Structures are given as C-alpha cells and as structure tokens.
Ligand binder design. Structure first.
Ligand code: CA
Length: 516
C-alpha cells in the first residue's frame, strides 16, 4: 500500500442485494441458504435498498416497514449482518430496468412551486429524487422517515452493521446531470440542473447575500448587469465549461452549485445521527458517483463532473467529515483510457478521492461500477482496495456471483479475505545509514511486486538488531515475498537472496523469520 503500510486491518467485504424484492426473486428459505454460502466466501454483510416509495407509499406517516423487518429476520436466521440503504430516490423507471419504485407520489403536492424537482439547461424535468434545494421538505420527510425506520429496526439492532443514506439519484450525492432524456448519458458532457424558477432565485439571493447589492456584484464580476433579475445560471453550458468557469462569476456559480450538496450532506448527516445513533451506534455513510468520462477532455475539462456537482473534491469531502459520514466511491474495477472521445479516467479519479479521503481521515469504502464477469477485473479491484486503504468493498451484485460458482471462488480468493496482523522479520540486512528496508510480494495485499509506490516498509529493532514489521496480511492465502533495500535516494539497492513464502498465512498472529 501507498505510504509504506499494509492493507486496512478493518477491511470487510459486502454483497449488494438484488433490485427486486427477495420473494420476487427466490423465497426466504433459499435466501437464507444463499446468505450462508456468501458468508462461507468471506462476505460479512448484505447491503440492501429499502425504497421510500414502498415504505411510505399511501401518504404522510402511513409507514410499512413490514418488508424490511422480514428481510432482517432472515438475515438473522442465516447468521449474517446487513447494511440497509434508505433509498429516498427512484428505482428504475425505464424498461429494461429491474424495478420501478418512484418516490411517494403525494410528496409532490407538498408544494405548488417548482422547488421540489430539477430542470436542465434545455428544460428537461427530473423527479427521481427531491431537489436538495427544498430543505424544509427534506428535513421534515427524511427526519420522519429516518426516525420511524430506527423504531421499526430496533428489535434487530444486533444484525445491523452500518446504515447508508441516499444523497441524490441512484443513491449518490449529486445532480441528475447525466440522463438519456436530457441527452447527457455517458460519455457526453453533463448539463447543469439549476433551471427551475426556485433554483434561479436561490442563486440570486445567495449572490446578493455574498456581496450586498447589484453594484458590488458588478464590481466583483466585471460585468454590467442592469438589474438583479439578470443574475442567472449559465446561459450556455458548453461555453461555460469551455471558459465561462474561469471568470469570477463562474467560480461563484460553481461554489453555490456544489455548496448545495455540501449543505444536503450536512442536513441528512444530522437527521441520521439523531435518528440512529443512540439505538444502533453504527457508522453511517453516503456515496459519491464515479463520473469518469470527459475527465481529461482538452476543451471542456471535467465536462461530466462539474454539472454533476463536483468541482472541488477536497471541499465535498470536508462536508462528509463535518457530517460524520463515511464515504463510498465506485469504479474500483476500471482502468484509465483517457482518449477521445470519452476521455475516461476512472482509475485516476479513484486514486485522487482515496488520497483526499485518507488525508482527511475519512473512512473509505468502494464498489465496482459494472458487473464483473471475469477475474482480471477482480484483480484491479484488489489493487485499489488493498493499496489505497479501503475499509470495505461491496460487490454489485448478488446474482453475478450467487449463480456462478467459478466467479464466487475467484472472488473469495482475492477479495473475500480476513486480514490478520503478522510479524515479518529479516535478519542480517546489510544496510548503511539512510537506507530503508521494505517488503513486496505477489498478492495485491503485498503491492504486487511494486517497489515504487506500494511496498511495505520495515523498521529496525535495535534490541533484536534486525528489521521487522507488524504487517496485516490476508489469512489463509499463500504468499510469496522478498525484502529489499532502498537507498536514502529512493532507488532499489539490492534484494533478499531467496524468495520467501507463507503457505498459507496463518489465521492466528505469529512471526515469519528469514535471513537476508
Ligand atoms: Ca412523512
């Protein structure tokens, strides 16, 4: 792993449930066996969406937690744990989709203005989730939904390992900037979604607030706005993204647009900590979408992210630290391409997020973006998960592994692991001052033979006068490894004479000793 350490000792693996309800897919009794198998394979919990549209369907406070309570008792029958997602967003809705669970149809009548939905630059309306702009309606409806959920789930606190919140569409904290209706699906640029009348007044009132009056706006921006109504979102998203963004106006607009998700993040964070904490005491998390296309496009840089609401990841992550929410990032199975026309750079994004997450001390978790049908993708997931300190990895989705024992078996070897602290000792290392000693080995957990950025560092035990390290390894997997010296200058100076091995690493903590 990066910075001379090993894999996150808290690492745990999770499986995503199907989108349909279990009784639509199998029967409770077969589920219980499937969970038991999944557990055999290193999975610790089943993550599952409970739809807002199912739980509060007929009207305000007319709750129905019966599917959720049943699902937990089976989880509890199988000796597993579960991570519920309170899916306050719409499931599917375009055929080919496995579900169609829109949010509760009565929530819209709560307002007679257009503040609860989204509208794009070209007027496309989106209603897959509530606009984080309407925070009064959010704080009521999600505070109520959170708090009732906590009441229906109390009898099961013992199988609840964490709770997820839905920050926006598809359960991600973003704007619905990439849709087929809005002519903005991968890999095209994203459209801004601040075109309701309500989003425009909000942007105006936040500018007047920041600078007082139109006269100081115009000084700040170098513009000649004739009246307060001319303060508006960008009139051409393409020019704004080509160069509009550099202007003072463009910084102010992006700062408000992303700021609305920093605010949302803090609101649900506070509503979920209040509903859940005292009773469950589990970590609460939220997700950021992996918007990897149009990343390194030379003339509309980050053309898909910005409109999604991601302009400054360091700022977005500070809001998560402040709400005490753990983050979940996706795309860990992908590689950078970065060529016309999609300009996709997923691996580079994941690395940037991980690094900011770890520097900020935010716990991190990952997911694959598409279904994995082959082991080379699992290998890529492991490189990222074990070298960038991921605390957990969740696999989408259930049916891919459950009815394919070959893939299940590949998943278990490479990602279904149990981390165990081990002591590695190397005697008689011929170092001179300023040299450092590292190990590197064949699995992803060992940095895959990398000597440049993932090697694990050892340390000198004066007393025993040897180099040693407490390293976390995957229990019960065969490993090959070698120590090596790195001169004060960063260059590999020499290698251990014989390749070492541990077959397999043992389940109980102990030491592996070897000689230079
Ligand atoms: Ca309600």
């Amino acid at each position: 792993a990066v910075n001379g350490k090993g894999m996150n000792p808290d690492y745990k693996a999770y499986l995503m449930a199907p989108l349909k309800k279990i009784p639509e897919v199998t029967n409770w009794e077969t589920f219980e066996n499937d969970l038991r198998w999944a557990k055999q394979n290193g999975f610790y919990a089943i993550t599952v969406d409970f739809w807002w549209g199912d739980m509060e369907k007929n009207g305000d406070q007319q709750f129905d937690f019966s599917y959720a309570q049943r699902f937990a008792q089976s989880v509890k029958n199988a000796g597993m744990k579960m991570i519920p997602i309170i899916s306050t967003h719409q499931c599917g809705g375009n055929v080919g989709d496995d579900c169609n669970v829109p949010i509760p149809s009565w929530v819209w009548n709560q307002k007679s203005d257009d503040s609860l939905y989204f509208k794009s630059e070209t007027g496309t309306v989106n209603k897959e989730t509530l606009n984080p702009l309407a925070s009064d309606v959010i704080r009521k409806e999600y505070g109520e939904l959170y708090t009732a959920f906590a009441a229906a789930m109390k009898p099961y606190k013992d199988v609840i390992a964490k709770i997820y919140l839905s920050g926006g569409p598809a359960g991600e904290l973003r704007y619905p900037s990439y849709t087929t209706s809005d002519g903005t699906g991968y890999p095209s640029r994203g459209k801004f979604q601040a075109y309701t009348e309500f989003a425009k007044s909000k942007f105006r009132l936040w500018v007047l607030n920041k600078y007082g009056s139109l006269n100081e706006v115009n000084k700040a921006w170098g513009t000649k706005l004739i009246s307060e109504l001319a303060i508006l979102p960008p009139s051409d998203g393409e020019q704004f993204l080509m160069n509009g963004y550099l202007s003072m106006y463009g910084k102010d607009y992006l700062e408000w647009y992303q700021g609305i998700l920093e605010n949302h993040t803090k609101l649900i964070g506070e509503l979920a900590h209040n509903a859940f904490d005292t009773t469950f005491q589990v970590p609460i998390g939220a997700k950021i979408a992996g918007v990897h296309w149009q990343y390194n496009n030379p003339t509309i840089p980050h053309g898909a992210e910005k409109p999604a609401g991601y302009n400054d990841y360091s700022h977005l992550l500070d809001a998560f630290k402040s709400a005490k929410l753990d983050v979940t990032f996706t795309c860990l199975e992908m590689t950078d391409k970065g060529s016309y026309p999609e300009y996709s750079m997923p691996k580079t994004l994941v690395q940037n997020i991980a690094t900011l997450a770890n520097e900020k001390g935010i716990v991190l978790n990952g997911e694959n973006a598409l279904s994995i049908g082959n082991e080379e993708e699992y290998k890529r997931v492991a490189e990222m998960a074990f070298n960038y300190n991921f605390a957990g990895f969740t696999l989408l989705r259930y049916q891919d592994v459950m009815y394919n024992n070959s893939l299940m078996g590949k998943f278990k070897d490479l990602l279904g692991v149990t981390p165990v602290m081990q002591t590695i000792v190397v005697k008689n290392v011929p170092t001179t001052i300023g040299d450092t000693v590292y190990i590197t080995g064949n699995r992803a957990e060992l940095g895959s033979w990398d000597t440049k950025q993932y090697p694990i560092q050892l340390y000198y035990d004066s007393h025993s006068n040897d180099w040693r390290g407490n390293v976390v390894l995957p229990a019960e997997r065969n490993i090959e490894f070698k120590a090596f010296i790195k001169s004060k200058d960063g260059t590999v100076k020499s290698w251990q004479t014989i390749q070492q091995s541990w077959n397999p690493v043992p389940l109980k903590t102990t030491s592996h000793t070897s000689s230079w």
